Amino acid sequence: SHRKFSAPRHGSLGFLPRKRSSRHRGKVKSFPKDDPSKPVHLTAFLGYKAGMTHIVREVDRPGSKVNKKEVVEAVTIVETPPMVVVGIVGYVETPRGLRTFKTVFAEHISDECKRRFYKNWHKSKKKAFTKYCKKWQDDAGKRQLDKDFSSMKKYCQVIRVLAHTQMRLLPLRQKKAHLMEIQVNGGTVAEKLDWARERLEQQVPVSQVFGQDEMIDVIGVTKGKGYKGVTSRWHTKKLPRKTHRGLRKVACIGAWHPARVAFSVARAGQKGYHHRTEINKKIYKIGQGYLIKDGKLIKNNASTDYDLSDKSINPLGGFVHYGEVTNDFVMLKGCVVGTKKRVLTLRKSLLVQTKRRALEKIDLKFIDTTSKFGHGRFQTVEEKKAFMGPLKKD
Amino acid sequence: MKVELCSFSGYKIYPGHGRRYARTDGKVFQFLNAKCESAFLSKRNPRQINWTVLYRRKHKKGQ
Amino acid sequence: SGAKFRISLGLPVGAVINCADNTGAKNLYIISVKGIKGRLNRLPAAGVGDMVMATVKKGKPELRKKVHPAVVIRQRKSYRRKDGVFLYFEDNAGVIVNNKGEMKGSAITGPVAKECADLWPRIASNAGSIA
RNA sequence: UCUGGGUCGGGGUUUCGUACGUAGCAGAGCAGCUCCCUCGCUGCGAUCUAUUGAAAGUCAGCCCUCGACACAAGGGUUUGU
RNA sequence: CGUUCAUAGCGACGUCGCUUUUUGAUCCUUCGAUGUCGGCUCUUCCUAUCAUUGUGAAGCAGAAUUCACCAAGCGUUGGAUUGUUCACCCACUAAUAGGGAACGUGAGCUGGGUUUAGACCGUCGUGAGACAGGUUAGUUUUACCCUACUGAUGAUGUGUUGUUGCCAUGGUAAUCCUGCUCAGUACGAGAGGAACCGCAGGUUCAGACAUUUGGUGUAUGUGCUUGGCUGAGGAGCCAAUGGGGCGAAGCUACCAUCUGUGGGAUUAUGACUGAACGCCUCUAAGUCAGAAUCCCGCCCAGGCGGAACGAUACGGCAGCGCCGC
RNA sequence: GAAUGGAUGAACGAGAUUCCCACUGUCCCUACCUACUAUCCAGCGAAACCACAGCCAAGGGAACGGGCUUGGCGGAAUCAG
RNA sequence: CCUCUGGCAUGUUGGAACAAUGUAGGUAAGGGAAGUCGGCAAGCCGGAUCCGUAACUUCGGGAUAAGGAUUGGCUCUAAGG
RNA sequence: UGGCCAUGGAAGUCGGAAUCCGCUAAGGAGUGUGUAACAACUCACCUGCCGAAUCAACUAGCCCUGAAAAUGGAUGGCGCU
RNA sequence: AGGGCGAAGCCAGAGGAAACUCUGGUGGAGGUCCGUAGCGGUCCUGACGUGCAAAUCGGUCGUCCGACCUGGGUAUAGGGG
Ligand SMILES: [Mg+2]
Ligand SMILES: [Mg+2]
Ligand SMILES: [Mg+2]
Ligand SMILES: [Mg+2]
Ligand SMILES: [Mg+2]
Ligand SMILES: [Mg+2]
Ligand SMILES: [Mg+2]
Ligand SMILES: [Mg+2]
Ligand SMILES: [Mg+2]
Ligand SMILES: [Mg+2]
Ligand SMILES: [Mg+2]
Ligand SMILES: [Mg+2]
Ligand SMILES: [Mg+2]
Ligand SMILES: [Mg+2]
Ligand SMILES: [Mg+2]
Ligand SMILES: [Mg+2]
Ligand SMILES: [Mg+2]
Ligand SMILES: [Mg+2]
Ligand SMILES: [Mg+2]
Ligand SMILES: [Mg+2]
Ligand SMILES: [Mg+2]
Ligand SMILES: [Mg+2]
Ligand SMILES: [Mg+2]
Ligand SMILES: [Mg+2]
Ligand SMILES: [Mg+2]
Ligand SMILES: [Mg+2]
Ligand SMILES: [Mg+2]
Ligand SMILES: [Mg+2]
Ligand SMILES: [Mg+2]
Ligand SMILES: [Mg+2]
Ligand SMILES: [Mg+2]
Ligand SMILES: [Mg+2]
Ligand SMILES: [Mg+2]
Ligand SMILES: [Mg+2]
Ligand SMILES: [Mg+2]
Question: What is the distance in angstroms between the Cα of B29 and the nearest Cα belonging to chain C?
């Protein structure tokens, strides 16, 4: 018989094999369509989820009840120290797909990057790209290099730069810097390639990719939760108290007579550590890192035009389970995928953004900087020292 | 962003945090956190409780 | 013009919020919440500012033994305002009302939540304190 | 050997709510002794004040130390166009 | 019949069918047993479409509407009584459409009801006993096998190894509503009373997340306190977590917060040019618009499928890469 | 329907119902914690069951096939469920 | 419930983890039986002293009816041989 | 020619018995629209243009409508014009 | 075990003209109530369900001076007890 009282089914099939993702670094499954017209640029970046916090802002959507009313708002800090371009890699269209065609690597490559290429660095002699870099200083090699670049000019269509992180500049344990292919979207391929050939071995900061009040897509791996039962992993009803063989289950897997259990039926398995591409996360603040002209410039982070203090986005006692954000960072609206410390791919949108909400200009009023390691009540240490007065530790 | 003061302890309450109580007499209280609010609801006279501002004013601490 | 925003709604069907207008009713047994499509097994729930059908369980015998519309005015479940302040109210409470939003009483004892005030003007007019 | 990661220590953060001891003309009263002084002295006495936002915990999956201590090319199995 | 008018909507007397969500026939299968109703829970299909999209109809002025077409994408709820299926009532709603899967689903539950044994009542029986007549009390076993599904190591290949990648094939997702505006406007004698574009939000669903609010809390963190026990103080312990305040981190909640997209072919339909048929016709050759559809996109997984690039065993015995013969 | 006992009835009942107050995770709607498991390891080590076996759709067929026909297809060995 | 006398080695094993399902305990915001055949299960209540105690009744009961208040520590007083 | 029956109005026109003559080139005592009823409109006979076949009623072949089911599916399959 | 209720009888005081009645005690009745050991075995339709167990375990329960529980001895034997 039919099921009596209808109800929409639990969980989406558009997300499954609900298995542990192969990758850790979230792949960009599609870069935006390079119109050939606008100038060249990078489409993606690779940051790190340092931590959350508040903002306060005046909102300007006329019509709303909240028009010209200061709301608060959660935000993620994605610490994003500049990447280093160490390669380009040409692709060519085929009817089979999109074959990689030619990879030209830079001359010098950091041990940050070289780390990646060995499973055990302690034990290696660190001999990678050793016979490669010989090419970059002779007649023969330099000529072959030029012919490779020329061939890419003749044949290739898509060009991706290879860059990698500056694992050096982070509070993370790891030294093995994440590489990633990032796509150069812009003018003609010959122009496109000579841009990336100029950028080779060079820094690239965040502000060169992204701008403020820009919708971007966060790509990463979800905070993993191990083996989980069907009630956790699918949010199935619990069965009642009296159930004899347990109650965090599904009762009827399936009907008798497709005499197999279907792929659509809810089973217990891996919950979390899935790959996920959340879209439309507006950049409220691209924040300038600590720098030196005479003394430190720690202010330039979490100070606003209306606050004017001497904060950084770092709260008291740091971001928890992370560190100090001593580098440039972006500040997205809302939560994003994954854990603290997780490497996170940003990506420019796939989508022509023209909604009132997606063109809204964000002027921040106040960044909360109170500790997250307990219930914080002081924004800065100087404020605390004022409020408390002197302590026995003096 | 009018920073308010905790009706128990005395600390300031920054926009994000804490909770707002609206008693039927028709007067309102702000609590920094639950710790304050619990002492308030259990009727603890904050001048008796050391860590509050009201106590330390009463006992002339600092200065 | 400007619409409501959702708020943590802590009156499922089965609550007896106290009538806070001068009718003569004391309680308001919420038998249903107006404008709820709802899902299997799920109780219809009315926060503050929500319309509601309401049997009176104790009070005058004119009102008893029939259904009236009503509005929830305070509620003990702490909702979050858009300015990031949570707020709760000490008591759940409402007012008997007609289809078109007018009160059938005349004066509201206690404070009304401004989520309810802005959305219900005739309630707001008879409300002494707001928020 | 971007000298490193680790243990201990030190800060920071934070949780709780002000330790022991000592002192007090604080302390409902009571007692012993007498100089029967009843503010006599001396003792008992919940609690109170002060020292004292003190004490104590705070990565084990918080943050910074570059202070102290050692320890850091070591072992085993592999695989060939 | 529908004032008038067979056919807007209907439809007698007659007639032709489909259907197996009714009940009968029948007894082919199973009596060395296929667990016998209902409810819960969960998935999937069908359409004979209640709503939602696109449309033709009216006895369609508007509003409300019934009739029909494409169409099953997405929905179709909360309760009172009843073991119920069914039924009815209240309430909300956009709508509270209908079914199938061994009358889906007992090694999934439950066991209220049927349907052992204990008992009561009525009617029947001389009686033992009987009763699709009522009542109450009454054991719900087993998975470690194979498959299927869920996730988890691996597998053959590529000389070995690592890299960054492509993408065959699978899956797939968004939903509907309110308010404001249009506007007391069109339409209408009035009564009443729309719609497209905007704008603001919300339902249900999905995917995350923990700044904040809440929950947990054996950091057994820090007080407080019972009975006992270290002669007492101090410091502690025991009482299967002695109890209780408050509680970091961490999990976690429409109980907190964030995000949810674009094309193509066309269907129904309405059209163009235009014969057949010196006219006329959307059609016959030819052309246009066209959708909750379908296919892709995005999104998830990634093939006994490929890719470019790196390094390729100094040695103490080594072993190999090219080249030519 | 009247000792096949009728009508009653305080007290009593691990007896059968119905409502109200209180109270609650019964539920809305699930969540976190603890202990013993399950898990991996050393040692030890059973049983039921077993024609052969074990991927599907449809067909026909003793009228619901793992095996047959026609199609889809098929990749070692395993782990927790 | 904790202790001495006396008695034991945790009931036929150990180690490492802390997943899903369980078994046995706990706690939960707002609501409070909307759950379910049915408040099943758990929760409320609980000791004592002082008040206060209904209908009904076989006058014995009902009755701890219901419904209220108090409770610690300390320092004293008075009353009982 | 308000023809007759029917008055409730049918002078062609809800219906029904009738149902012919004149002018005629020729128009039914009327196919409908519609009217309280008319009116008004609409539906032969003949021309003007154009330039050979035209049109009706049956009948039977293929094709199509009629033609709705639940795991995804079967002229045996692939396919075939 | 320990508690509760407090029947007859008895004392005093007060009233009553008498009959006798009230008030305070004492007294300790009962197939009386709570509740241990004991005896039992309601519910969870809990655990277990190739068990610890061919009927056990946990909480929750009934009863707990009486038709009470219980050892040994002794009697009744199969259409018989
Ligand atoms: Mg259905
Ligand atoms: Mg059971
Ligand atoms: Mg925090
Ligand atoms: Mg339900
Ligand atoms: Mg007729
Ligand atoms: Mg049959
Ligand atoms: Mg079976
Ligand atoms: Mg149809
Ligand atoms: Mg069945
Ligand atoms: Mg089954
Ligand atoms: Mg069973
Ligand atoms: Mg039964
Ligand atoms: Mg029976
Ligand atoms: Mg096992
Ligand atoms: Mg002590
Ligand atoms: Mg014990
Ligand atoms: Mg057409
Ligand atoms: Mg077209
Ligand atoms: Mg189109
Ligand atoms: Mg696809
Ligand atoms: Mg009789
Ligand atoms: Mg008689
Ligand atoms: Mg009888
Ligand atoms: Mg078989
Ligand atoms: Mg033990
Ligand atoms: Mg042992
Ligand atoms: Mg033993
Ligand atoms: Mg609760
Ligand atoms: Mg129900
Ligand atoms: Mg119910
Ligand atoms: Mg119970
Ligand atoms: Mg009673
Ligand atoms: Mg059982
Ligand atoms: Mg078992
Ligand atoms: Mg044992």
Answer: 10
> How far apart are the C-alpha atoms of A201 and A110, rounded to whole Å?
9
Experiment type? cryo-EM
Instruction: Give the whole-angstrom CA distance, residue C41 versus residue A6.
Output: 11
Structure tokens that stand for A278 in this block: 């959340």
Q: Which amino acid is at B63?
A: Q
- Is the sign of the CA dihedral A379, A380, A381, A387 positive or negative? negative
Measured to protein CB atoms, the chain I nucleotides within 7 Å are: 44-47, 49
Residues facing A332 on adjacent strands: A76, A283
Residue among A361, A341, A354 nearest A282 (CA) = A361
The residue assigned the tokens 């122009």 is: A191
> What separation in angstroms does the CA of A76 have from each of A249, A257, A274, A285?
36, 50, 20, 10
Considering CB atoms only, which of C2, C5, C118 is closest to A63? Answer: C2
* CA A260 / ligand 9 centre spacing (Å): 18
Nucleic strand G near CB of residue C38 (< 7 Å):
no
Residue A63, number of CB atoms within 10 A of its CB: 10
- Write out chain B residues lying below 8 Å of A56, CB-based: 1, 15
Backbone angles phi, psi at A196, to 5 degrees: -70, -30
Resolution (A): 4.2
Cβ of A258 near strand H (under 7 Å)? The reply is yes
Helix (H) or strand (E) holding C69: strand C67-74
Mutation target vs B (from A54, A377, A385, A387; most B CBs, 10 A cutoff): A377
Q: How far is B15 from chain C (nearest CA, A)?
A: 7
Phi, psi of A344 (to 5 degrees): -145, 125
C103 neighbors C122 (Cβ within 8 angstroms): yes
Q: How far is the CA of A385 from the C1' of D30 (A)?
A: 50
Phi then psi for A46, rounded to 5 degrees? -130, 105
Whether chain A has a CB inside 8 Å of the CB on C5: the answer is yes
CA distance C51 to C30: 10
**Burial classification of residue B61, based on how many CB atoms lie within 10 Å of its CB (0-12 exposed, 13-18 middle, 19 or more buried):** exposed
Burial class of residue C71 (count of CB atoms within 10 Å of its CB; 0-12, 13-18, 19+): buried
Mutate: best of A10, A65, A365, partner C, most C CBs <10 A: A65
CB A203 within 8 Å of CB A84: yes
To 10 degrees, what angle do helices A139-155 and A189-198 make? 140
Classify the phi-psi angles of C115: left when phi > 0, otherwise alpha if psi is within -120 to 50, otherwise beta: alpha
